[PDB]
Tab-separated table of N, CA and C and ligand atoms in Angstrom:
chain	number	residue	atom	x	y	z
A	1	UNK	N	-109.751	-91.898	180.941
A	1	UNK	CA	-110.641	-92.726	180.147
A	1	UNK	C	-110.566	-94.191	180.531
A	2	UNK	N	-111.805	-94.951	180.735
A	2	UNK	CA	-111.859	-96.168	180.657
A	2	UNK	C	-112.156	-97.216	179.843
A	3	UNK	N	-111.690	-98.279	179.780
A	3	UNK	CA	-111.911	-99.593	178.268
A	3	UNK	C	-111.220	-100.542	179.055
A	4	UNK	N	-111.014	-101.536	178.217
A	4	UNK	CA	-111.097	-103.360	178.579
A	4	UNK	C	-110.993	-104.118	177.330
A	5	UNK	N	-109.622	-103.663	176.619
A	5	UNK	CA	-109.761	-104.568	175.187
A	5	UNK	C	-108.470	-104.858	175.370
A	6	UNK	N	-108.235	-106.031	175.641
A	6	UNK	CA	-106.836	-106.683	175.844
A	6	UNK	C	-105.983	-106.458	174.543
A	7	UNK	N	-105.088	-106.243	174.337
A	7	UNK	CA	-104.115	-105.832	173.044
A	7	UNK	C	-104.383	-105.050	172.533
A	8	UNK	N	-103.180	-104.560	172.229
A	8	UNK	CA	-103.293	-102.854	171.498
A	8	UNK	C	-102.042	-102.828	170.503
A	9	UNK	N	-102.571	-102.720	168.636
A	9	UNK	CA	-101.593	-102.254	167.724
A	9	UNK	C	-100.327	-101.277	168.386
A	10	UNK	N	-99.278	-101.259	168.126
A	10	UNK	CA	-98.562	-100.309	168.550
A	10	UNK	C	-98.448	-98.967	167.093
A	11	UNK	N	-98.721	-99.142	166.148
A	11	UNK	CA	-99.030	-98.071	164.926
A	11	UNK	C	-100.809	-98.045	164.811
A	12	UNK	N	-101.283	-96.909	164.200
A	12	UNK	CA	-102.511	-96.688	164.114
A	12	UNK	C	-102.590	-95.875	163.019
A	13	UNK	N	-103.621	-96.494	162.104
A	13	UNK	CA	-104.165	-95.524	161.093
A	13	UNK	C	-105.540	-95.110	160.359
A	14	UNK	N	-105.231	-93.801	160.055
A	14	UNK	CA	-106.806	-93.131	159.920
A	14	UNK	C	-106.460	-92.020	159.650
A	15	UNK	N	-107.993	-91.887	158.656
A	15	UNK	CA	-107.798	-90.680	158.212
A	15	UNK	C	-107.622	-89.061	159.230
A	16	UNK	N	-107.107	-88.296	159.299
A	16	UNK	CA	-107.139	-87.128	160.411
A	16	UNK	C	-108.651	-86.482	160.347
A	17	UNK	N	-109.504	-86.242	161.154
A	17	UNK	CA	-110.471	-85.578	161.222
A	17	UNK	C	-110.640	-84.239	161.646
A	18	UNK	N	-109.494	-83.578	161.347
A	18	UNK	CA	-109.365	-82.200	161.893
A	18	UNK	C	-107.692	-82.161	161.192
A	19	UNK	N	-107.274	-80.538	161.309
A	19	UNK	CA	-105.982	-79.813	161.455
A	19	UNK	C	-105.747	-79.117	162.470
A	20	UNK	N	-105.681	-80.021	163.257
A	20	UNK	CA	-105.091	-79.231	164.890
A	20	UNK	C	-104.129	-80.486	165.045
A	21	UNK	N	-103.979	-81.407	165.196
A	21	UNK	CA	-102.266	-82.165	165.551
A	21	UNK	C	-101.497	-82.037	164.568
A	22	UNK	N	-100.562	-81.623	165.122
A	22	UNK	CA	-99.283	-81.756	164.166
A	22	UNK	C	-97.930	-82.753	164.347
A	23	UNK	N	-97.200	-83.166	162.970
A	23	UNK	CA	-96.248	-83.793	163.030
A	23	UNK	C	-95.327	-83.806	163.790
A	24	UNK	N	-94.295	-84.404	164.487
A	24	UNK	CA	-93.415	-84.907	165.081
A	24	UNK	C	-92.075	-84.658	164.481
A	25	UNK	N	-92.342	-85.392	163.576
A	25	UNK	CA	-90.768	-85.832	162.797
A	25	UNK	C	-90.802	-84.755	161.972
A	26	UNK	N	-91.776	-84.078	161.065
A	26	UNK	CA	-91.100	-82.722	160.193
A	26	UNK	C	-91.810	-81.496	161.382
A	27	UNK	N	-92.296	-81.819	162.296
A	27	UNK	CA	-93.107	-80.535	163.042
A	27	UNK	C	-94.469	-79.741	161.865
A	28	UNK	N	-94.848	-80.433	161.218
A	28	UNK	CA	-96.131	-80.032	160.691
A	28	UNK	C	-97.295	-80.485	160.650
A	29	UNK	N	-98.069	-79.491	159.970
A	29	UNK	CA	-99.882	-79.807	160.472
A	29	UNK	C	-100.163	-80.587	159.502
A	30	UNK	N	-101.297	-81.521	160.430
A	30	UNK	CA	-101.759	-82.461	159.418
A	30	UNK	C	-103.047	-82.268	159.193
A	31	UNK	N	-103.413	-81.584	157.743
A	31	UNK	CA	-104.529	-81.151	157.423
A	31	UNK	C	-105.726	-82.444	157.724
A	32	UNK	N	-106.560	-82.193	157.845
A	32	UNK	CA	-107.845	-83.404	158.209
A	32	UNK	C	-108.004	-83.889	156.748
A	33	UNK	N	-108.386	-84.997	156.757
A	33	UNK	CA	-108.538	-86.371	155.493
A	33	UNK	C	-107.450	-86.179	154.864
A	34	UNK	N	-106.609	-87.057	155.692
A	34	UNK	CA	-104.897	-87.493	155.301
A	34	UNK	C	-104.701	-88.237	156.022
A	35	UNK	N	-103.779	-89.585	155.516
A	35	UNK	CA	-103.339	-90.711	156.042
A	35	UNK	C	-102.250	-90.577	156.819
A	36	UNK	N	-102.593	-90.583	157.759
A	36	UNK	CA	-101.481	-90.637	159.026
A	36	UNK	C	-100.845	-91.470	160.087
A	37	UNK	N	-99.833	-91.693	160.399
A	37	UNK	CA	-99.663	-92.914	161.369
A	37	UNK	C	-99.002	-92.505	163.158
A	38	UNK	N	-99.945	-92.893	163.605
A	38	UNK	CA	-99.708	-92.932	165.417
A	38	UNK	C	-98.931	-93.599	165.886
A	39	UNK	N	-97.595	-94.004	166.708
A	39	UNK	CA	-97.005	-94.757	167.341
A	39	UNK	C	-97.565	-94.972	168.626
A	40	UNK	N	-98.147	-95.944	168.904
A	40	UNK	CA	-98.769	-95.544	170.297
A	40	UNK	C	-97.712	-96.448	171.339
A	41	UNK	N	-97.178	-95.865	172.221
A	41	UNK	CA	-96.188	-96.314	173.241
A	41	UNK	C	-96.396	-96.041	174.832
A	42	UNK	N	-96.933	-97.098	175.103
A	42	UNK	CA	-97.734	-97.475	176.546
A	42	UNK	C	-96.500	-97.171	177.640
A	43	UNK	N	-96.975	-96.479	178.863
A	43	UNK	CA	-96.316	-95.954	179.771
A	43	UNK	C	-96.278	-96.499	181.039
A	44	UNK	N	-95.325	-96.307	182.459
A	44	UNK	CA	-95.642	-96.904	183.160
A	44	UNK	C	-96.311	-96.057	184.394
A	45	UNK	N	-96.314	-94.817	184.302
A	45	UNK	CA	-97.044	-93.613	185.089
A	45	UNK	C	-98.276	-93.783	184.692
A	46	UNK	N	-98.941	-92.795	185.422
A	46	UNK	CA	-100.307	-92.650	185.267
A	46	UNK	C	-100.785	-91.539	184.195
A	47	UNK	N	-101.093	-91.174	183.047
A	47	UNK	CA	-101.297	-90.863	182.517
A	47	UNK	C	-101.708	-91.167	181.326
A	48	UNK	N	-102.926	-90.765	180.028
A	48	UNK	CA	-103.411	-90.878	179.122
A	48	UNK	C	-102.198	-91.213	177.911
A	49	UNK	N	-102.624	-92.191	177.050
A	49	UNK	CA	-101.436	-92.421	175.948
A	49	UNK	C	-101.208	-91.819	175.249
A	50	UNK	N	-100.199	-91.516	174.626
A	50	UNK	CA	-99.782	-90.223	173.993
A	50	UNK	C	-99.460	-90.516	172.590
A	51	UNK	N	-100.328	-90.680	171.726
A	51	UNK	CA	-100.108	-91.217	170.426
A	51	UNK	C	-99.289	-90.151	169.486
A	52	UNK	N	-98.071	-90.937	169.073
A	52	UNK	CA	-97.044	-89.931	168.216
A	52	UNK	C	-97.240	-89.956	166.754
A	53	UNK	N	-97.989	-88.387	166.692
A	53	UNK	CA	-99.110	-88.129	165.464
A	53	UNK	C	-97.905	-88.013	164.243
A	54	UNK	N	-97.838	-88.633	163.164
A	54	UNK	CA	-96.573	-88.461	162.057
A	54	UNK	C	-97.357	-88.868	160.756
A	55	UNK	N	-96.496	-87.710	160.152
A	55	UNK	CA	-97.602	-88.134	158.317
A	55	UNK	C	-96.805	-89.119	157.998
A	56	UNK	N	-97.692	-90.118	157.325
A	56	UNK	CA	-97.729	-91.293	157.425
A	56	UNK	C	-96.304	-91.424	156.185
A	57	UNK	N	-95.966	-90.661	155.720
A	57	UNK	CA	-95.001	-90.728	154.378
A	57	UNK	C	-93.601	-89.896	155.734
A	58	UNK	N	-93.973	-89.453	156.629
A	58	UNK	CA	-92.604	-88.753	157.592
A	58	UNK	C	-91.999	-89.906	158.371
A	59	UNK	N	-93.151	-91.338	158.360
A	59	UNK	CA	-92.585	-92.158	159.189
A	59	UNK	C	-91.900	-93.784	158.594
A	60	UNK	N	-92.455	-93.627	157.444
A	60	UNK	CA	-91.874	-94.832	156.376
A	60	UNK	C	-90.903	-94.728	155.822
A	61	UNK	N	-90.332	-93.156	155.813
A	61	UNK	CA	-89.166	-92.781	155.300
A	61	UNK	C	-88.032	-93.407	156.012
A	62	UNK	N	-88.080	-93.511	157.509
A	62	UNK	CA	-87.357	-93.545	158.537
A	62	UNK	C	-87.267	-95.225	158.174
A	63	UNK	N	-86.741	-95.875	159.689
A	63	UNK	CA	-86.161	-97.244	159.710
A	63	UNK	C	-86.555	-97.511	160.660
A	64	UNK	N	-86.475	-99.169	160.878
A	64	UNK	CA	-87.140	-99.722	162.218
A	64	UNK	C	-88.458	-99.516	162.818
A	65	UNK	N	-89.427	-99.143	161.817
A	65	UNK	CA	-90.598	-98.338	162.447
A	65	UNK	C	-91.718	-99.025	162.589
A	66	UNK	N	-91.955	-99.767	161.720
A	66	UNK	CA	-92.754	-100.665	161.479
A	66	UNK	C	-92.442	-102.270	161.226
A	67	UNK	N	-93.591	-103.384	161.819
A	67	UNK	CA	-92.504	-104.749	161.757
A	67	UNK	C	-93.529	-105.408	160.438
A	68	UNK	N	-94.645	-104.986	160.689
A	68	UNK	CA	-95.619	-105.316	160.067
A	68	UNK	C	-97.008	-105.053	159.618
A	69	UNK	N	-97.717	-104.883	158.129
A	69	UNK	CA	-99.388	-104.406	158.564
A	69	UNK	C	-100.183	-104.928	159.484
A	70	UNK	N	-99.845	-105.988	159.661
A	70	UNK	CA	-100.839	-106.469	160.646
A	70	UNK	C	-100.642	-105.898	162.031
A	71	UNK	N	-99.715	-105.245	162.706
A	71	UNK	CA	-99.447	-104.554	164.087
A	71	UNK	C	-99.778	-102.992	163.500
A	72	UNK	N	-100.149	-102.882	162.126
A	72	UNK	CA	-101.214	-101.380	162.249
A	72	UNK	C	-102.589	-101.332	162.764
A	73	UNK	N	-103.289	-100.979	162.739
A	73	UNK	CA	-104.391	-100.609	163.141
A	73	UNK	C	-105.193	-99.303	162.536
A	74	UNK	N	-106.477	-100.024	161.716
A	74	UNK	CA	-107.437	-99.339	160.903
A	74	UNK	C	-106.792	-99.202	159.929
A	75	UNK	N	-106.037	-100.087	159.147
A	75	UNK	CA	-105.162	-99.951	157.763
A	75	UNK	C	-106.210	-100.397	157.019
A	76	UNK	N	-107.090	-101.596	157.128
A	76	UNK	CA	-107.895	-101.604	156.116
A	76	UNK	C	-108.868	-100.598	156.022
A	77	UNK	N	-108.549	-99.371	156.578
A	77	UNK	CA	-110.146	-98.442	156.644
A	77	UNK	C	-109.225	-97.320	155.517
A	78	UNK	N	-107.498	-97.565	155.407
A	78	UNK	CA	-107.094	-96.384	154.593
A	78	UNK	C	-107.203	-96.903	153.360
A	79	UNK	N	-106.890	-96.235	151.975
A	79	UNK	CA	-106.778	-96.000	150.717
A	79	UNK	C	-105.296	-96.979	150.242
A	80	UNK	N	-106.379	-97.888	149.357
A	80	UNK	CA	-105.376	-98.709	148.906
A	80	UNK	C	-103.933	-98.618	148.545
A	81	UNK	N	-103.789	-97.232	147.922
A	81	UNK	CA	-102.494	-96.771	147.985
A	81	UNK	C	-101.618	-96.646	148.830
A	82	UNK	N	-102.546	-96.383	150.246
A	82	UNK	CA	-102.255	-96.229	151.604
A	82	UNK	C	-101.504	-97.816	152.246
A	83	UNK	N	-102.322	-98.217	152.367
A	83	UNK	CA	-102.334	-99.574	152.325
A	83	UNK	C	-100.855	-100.233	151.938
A	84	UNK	N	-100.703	-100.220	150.410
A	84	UNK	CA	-99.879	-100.478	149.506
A	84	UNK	C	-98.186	-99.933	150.477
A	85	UNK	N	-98.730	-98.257	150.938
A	85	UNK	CA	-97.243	-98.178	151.311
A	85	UNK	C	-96.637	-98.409	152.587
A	86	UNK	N	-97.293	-99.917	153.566
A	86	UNK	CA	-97.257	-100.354	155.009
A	86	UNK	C	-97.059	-101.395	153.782
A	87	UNK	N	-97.492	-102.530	153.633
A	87	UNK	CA	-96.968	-103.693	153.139
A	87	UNK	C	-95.716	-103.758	152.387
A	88	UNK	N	-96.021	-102.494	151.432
A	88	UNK	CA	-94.912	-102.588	150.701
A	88	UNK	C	-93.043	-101.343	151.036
A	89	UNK	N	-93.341	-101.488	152.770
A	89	UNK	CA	-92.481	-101.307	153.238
A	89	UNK	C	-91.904	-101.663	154.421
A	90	UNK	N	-92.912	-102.824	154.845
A	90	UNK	CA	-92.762	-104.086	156.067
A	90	UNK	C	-92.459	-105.095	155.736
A	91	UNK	N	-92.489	-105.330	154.412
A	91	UNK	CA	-91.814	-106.466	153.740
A	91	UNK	C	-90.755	-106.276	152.632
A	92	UNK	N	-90.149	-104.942	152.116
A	92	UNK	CA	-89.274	-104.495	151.830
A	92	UNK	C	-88.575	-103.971	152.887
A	93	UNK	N	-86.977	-103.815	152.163
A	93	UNK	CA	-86.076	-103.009	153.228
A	93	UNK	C	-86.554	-101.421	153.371
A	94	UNK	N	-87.017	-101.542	154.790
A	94	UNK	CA	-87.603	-100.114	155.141
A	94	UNK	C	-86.305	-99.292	154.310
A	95	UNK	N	-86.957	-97.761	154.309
A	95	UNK	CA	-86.077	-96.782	154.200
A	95	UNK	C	-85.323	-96.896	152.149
A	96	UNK	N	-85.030	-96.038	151.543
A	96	UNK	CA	-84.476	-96.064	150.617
A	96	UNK	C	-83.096	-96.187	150.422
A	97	UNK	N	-82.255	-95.768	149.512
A	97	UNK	CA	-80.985	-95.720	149.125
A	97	UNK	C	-80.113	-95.908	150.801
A	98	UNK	N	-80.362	-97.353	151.077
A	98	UNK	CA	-79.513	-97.827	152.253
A	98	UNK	C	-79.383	-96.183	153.069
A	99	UNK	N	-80.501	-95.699	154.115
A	99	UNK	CA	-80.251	-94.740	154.415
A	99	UNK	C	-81.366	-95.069	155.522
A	100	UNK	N	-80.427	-96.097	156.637
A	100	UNK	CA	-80.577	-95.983	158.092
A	100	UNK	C	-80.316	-95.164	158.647
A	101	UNK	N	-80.625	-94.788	160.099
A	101	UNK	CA	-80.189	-93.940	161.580
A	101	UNK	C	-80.644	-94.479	162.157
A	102	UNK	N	-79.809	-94.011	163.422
A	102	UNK	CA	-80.313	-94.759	165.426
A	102	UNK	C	-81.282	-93.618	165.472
A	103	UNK	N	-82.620	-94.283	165.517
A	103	UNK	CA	-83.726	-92.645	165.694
A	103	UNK	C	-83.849	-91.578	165.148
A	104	UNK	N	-84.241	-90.757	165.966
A	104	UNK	CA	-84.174	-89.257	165.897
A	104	UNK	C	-82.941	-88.753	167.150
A	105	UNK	N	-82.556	-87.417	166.593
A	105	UNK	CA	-81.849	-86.527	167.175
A	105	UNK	C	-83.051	-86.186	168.618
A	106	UNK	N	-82.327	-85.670	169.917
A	106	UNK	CA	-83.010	-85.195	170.446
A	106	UNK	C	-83.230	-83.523	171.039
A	107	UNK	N	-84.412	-83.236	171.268
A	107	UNK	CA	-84.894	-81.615	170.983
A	107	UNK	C	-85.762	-81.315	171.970
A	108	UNK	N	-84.804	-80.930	173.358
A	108	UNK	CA	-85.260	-80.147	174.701
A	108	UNK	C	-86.590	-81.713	174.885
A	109	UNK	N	-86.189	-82.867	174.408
A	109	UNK	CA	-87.451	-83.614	175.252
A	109	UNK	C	-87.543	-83.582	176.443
A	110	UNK	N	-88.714	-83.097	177.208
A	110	UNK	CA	-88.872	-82.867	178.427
A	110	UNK	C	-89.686	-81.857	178.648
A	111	UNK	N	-89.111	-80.627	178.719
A	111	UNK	CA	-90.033	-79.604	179.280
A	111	UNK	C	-91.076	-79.165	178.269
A	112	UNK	N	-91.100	-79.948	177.022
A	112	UNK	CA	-92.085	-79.557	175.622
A	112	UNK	C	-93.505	-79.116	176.489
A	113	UNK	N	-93.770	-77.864	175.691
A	113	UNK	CA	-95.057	-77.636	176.439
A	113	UNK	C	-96.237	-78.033	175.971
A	114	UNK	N	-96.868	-78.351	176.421
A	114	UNK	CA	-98.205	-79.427	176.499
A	114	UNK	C	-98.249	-80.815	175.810
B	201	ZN	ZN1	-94.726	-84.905	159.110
């Protein structure tokens, strides 16, 4: 695919328009019209970007994930509630009951098929 728009959000959000991608972090489907968030993480090979599809409540749970709403993308197109839980966890201490981790565990990354 080709484009020409200098800067790119590194989170993305929108409603799902289908139930065919599934989650990451719990490995489940994300039914279509549900707020979801993309990590999008630019590569140095040649290949299409690989946006890391996560329900949007699988990835706020976590830490370090987000710095700010404004580095989302299409947040004002979600549901104020939606909305509500990117601000009001980019400017609070991510994560609940002091319950950081370094990432995720890792799981055969590599040969994942497709
Ligand atoms: Zn999930």
């Amino acid at each position: 695919g080709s484009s020409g728009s200098s800067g790119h959000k590194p989170w993305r959000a929108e409603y799902a328009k289908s139930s065919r991608s599934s989650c990451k972090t719990c490995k489940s489907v994300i039914n279509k019209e549900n707020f979801r968030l993309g990590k999008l993480v630019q590569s140095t090979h040649f290949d299409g970007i690989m946006p890391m599809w996560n329900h949007a409540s699988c990835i706020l749970k976590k830490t370090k994930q987000i710095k700010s709403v404004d580095d989302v993308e299409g947040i004002e197109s979600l549901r104020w509630e939606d909305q509500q839980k990117i601000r009001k966890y980019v400017e609070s201490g991510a994560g609940s009951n002091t319950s950081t981790s370094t990432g995720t565990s890792t799981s055969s990354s590599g040969p994942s098929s497709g």
